């Protein structure tokens, strides 16, 4: 067999009756979950895979596009010079899990090796159907709700030698993210356990040393519009935007509570989907609140530390593509001959 | 044809600002990073930091740290470098730079899926004079 | 953070001659990784070898771009007037201090 480019189905367990809008976009473009899910290991087979290009991401991509272009209207369009107008009602907007599925004739293979880093040969393969179910969460910086690392942390970069390439981490053990827009209407805040996030850096760091035996340094965002600076994540149909830089303000180098982030709710938003910018209804009142799991993380590698002894990590993110990615990086479509 | 095409010479005194505009023709300028290169009057090349025009994150060398800000508007397919708290230091040319395409007529495309540093397009750079 | 070093940094050079000019980086790299560039009197640069060996626009056949590691090579197998410049290997977002063409007199 040989990797081929399709139009792979969806499945999900979405519900008639739920007028949450993933439930209402899954209702009429995907089918129900499999009832008969089956791998098959592949004996003796080895394959590559590359997740950084990867025409499932590209196919998800369109996908959540349209996904949001049904479900999240706004109420003023300002792509270019032009302005576009519509009705602006507040939604239930919760992500839902999907699965994506091979069509007669073509095959999905699926990396069965746990320490695959995402690019290159793997010596453990299956054939599944569909892929496991993934929440389509579009956020920046933090990677919510996904899977987990099984072992040990994953550094995921197509050449982490070089600083323009993005860097997707997998994590093992989740970290709760609670934010809450309390009864200004606007600001909001969320809440992440010190003891637990520290150990976190601790197992990236460990993981990091492997590719830099350095001091290593976590500094916040330096640039970029707002959504890119923050993290910047949906709750309850609100668009949050928190200040990460109490998250990403260490150096460890080899030796010799709760963290509150503060946020906002913007109505004026860079969209993902493409250039322009989208305006939102003013906030609604009553109490939000969004309790999360971060299985993950996007980084950048500061450059140019022509001669240090330290490299430094910022968080990254904005192409949603790498949140597909953090996901999709185990498959890869054939087309079976 | 791809063109980089800077602003003018500027003369600007100690402890003021500067920018520096590229305005870009002839691709989809979303689509590919933009890098900045200083060269000193004798001296070589050094790189400076890239801006992705998609969402405007950067990357910038350690040593330019707190004297770079590289910005865009996307609307007008112009991409920016600003230097703050001039000194002598700073008295240089300035070039705006692009590597390779890479998307090859793909559906969604982003500079940082391209290598970036087979620099290929550049700027006619811009002549930055610090002095009182 | 790999180095890149140029060394000679001057060469003194005849028309005609075969010219060889050295790149080499601090840890081994991919040769995809390799360029090398040519810069007149200040202007912009412009690029002359991609991928160690594989010739840009508009550049002729007489430079021969090879190497491998740490060790690269870019040679001019006759040169002509138009080829003294100052020469660039980058590698990322490093380049080399340059190697000037000069006229050996």
């Known amino acids: 067999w040989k990797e081929a480019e399709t139009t792979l189905f969806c499945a999900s367990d979405a519900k008639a009756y739920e007028t949450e809008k993933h439930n209402v976009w899954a209702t009429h473009a995907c089918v129900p979950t499999d009832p008969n899910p089956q791998e098959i290991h592949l004996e003796n087979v080895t394959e590559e895979f590359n997740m950084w290009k990867n025409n499932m991401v590209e196919q998800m991509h369109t996908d959540i596009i349209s996904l949001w272009d049904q479900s999240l209207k706004p109420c003023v369009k300002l792509t270019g010079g032009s302005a576009i107008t519509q009705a602006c009602p507040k939604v239930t907007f919760e992500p839902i899990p999907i699965h994506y599925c091979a069509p007669a004739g073509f095959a999905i293979l699926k990396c069965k090796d746990e320490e695959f880093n995402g690019i290159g040969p793997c010596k453990n393969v299956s054939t599944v159907q569909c892929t496991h179910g993934i929440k389509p969460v579009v956020s920046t910086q933090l990677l919510l709700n996904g899977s987990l690392a099984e072992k040990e942390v994953k550094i995921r970069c197509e050449n982490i030698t070089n600083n323009a390439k993005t860097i997707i981490v997998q994590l093992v053990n989740p970290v709760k993210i609670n934010c809450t827009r309390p009864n200004d209407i606007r600001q909001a805040h969320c809440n992440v356990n010190r003891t637990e996030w520290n150990n976190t850096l601790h197992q990236v760091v460990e993981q990091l040393r492997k590719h830099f035996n350095k001091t290593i340094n976590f500094a916040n965002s330096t640039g970029g519009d707002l959504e890119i600076t923050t993290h910047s994540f949906n709750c309850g149909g609100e668009f949050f935007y928190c200040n990460t830089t109490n998250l990403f303000n260490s150096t460890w180098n080899h030796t010799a509570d709760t963290i509150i982030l503060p946020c906002r709710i913007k109505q004026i938003i860079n969209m993902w989907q493409r250039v322009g910018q989208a305006m939102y209804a003013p906030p609604i009142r009553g109490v939000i609140r969004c309790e999360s799991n971060i299985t993950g993380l996007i980084l950048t590698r500061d450059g140019g530390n022509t001669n240090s002894t330290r490299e430094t990590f910022r968080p990254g993110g904005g192409d949603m593509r790498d949140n597909w990615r953090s996901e999709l990086y185990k498959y890869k479509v054939v087309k079976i001959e | 044809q791809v063109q980089l095409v800077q602003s003018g010479t500027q003369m600007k005194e100690p402890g003021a600002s500067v920018t520096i505009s590229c305005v870009t023709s002839?691709?989809?300028?979303?689509?590919?990073?933009i890098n900045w290169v200083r060269q000193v009057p004798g001296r070589g090349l050094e790189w400076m930091g890239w801006?992705?025009?998609?969402?405007?994150?950067?990357n910038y060398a350690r040593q330019f740290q707190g004297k770079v800000t590289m910005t865009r508007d996307v609307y007008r397919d112009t991409a920016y470098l600003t230097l703050s708290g001039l000194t002598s230091g700073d008295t240089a040319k300035y070039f705006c730079?692009?590597?390779?395409?890479?998307?090859?007529?793909?559906?969604?495309?982003?500079?940082?899926?391209?290598?970036?540093?087979?620099?290929?397009?550049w700027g006619q750079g811009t002549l930055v004079i610090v002095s009182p | 953070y790999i180095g890149v070093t140029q060394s000679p940094a001057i060469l003194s050079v005849s028309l005609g001659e075969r010219v060889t000019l050295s790149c080499k980086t601090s840890?081994?790299?991919?040769?995809?990784?390799l360029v090398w560039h040519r810069q007149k009197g200040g202007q912009a640069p412009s690029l002359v070898m991609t991928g160690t060996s594989e010739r840009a626009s508009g550049i002729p056949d007489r430079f021969i771009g090879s190497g491998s590691g740490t060790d690269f090579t870019l040679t001019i197998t006759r040169l002509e007037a138009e080829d003294f410049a100052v020469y660039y290997c980058?590698?990322?977002?490093?380049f080399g201090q340059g190697t000037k063409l000069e006229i050996k007199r």
């Open positions: 840890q081994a790299i991919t040769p995809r990784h």
């Open positions: 730079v692009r590597g390779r395409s890479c998307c090859g007529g793909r559906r969604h495309c982003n500079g940082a899926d391209c290598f970036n540093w087979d620099f290929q397009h």
């Open positions: 002839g691709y989809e300028f979303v689509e590919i990073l």
């Open positions: 980058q590698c990322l977002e490093a």
């Open positions: 801006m992705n025009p998609r969402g405007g994150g950067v």
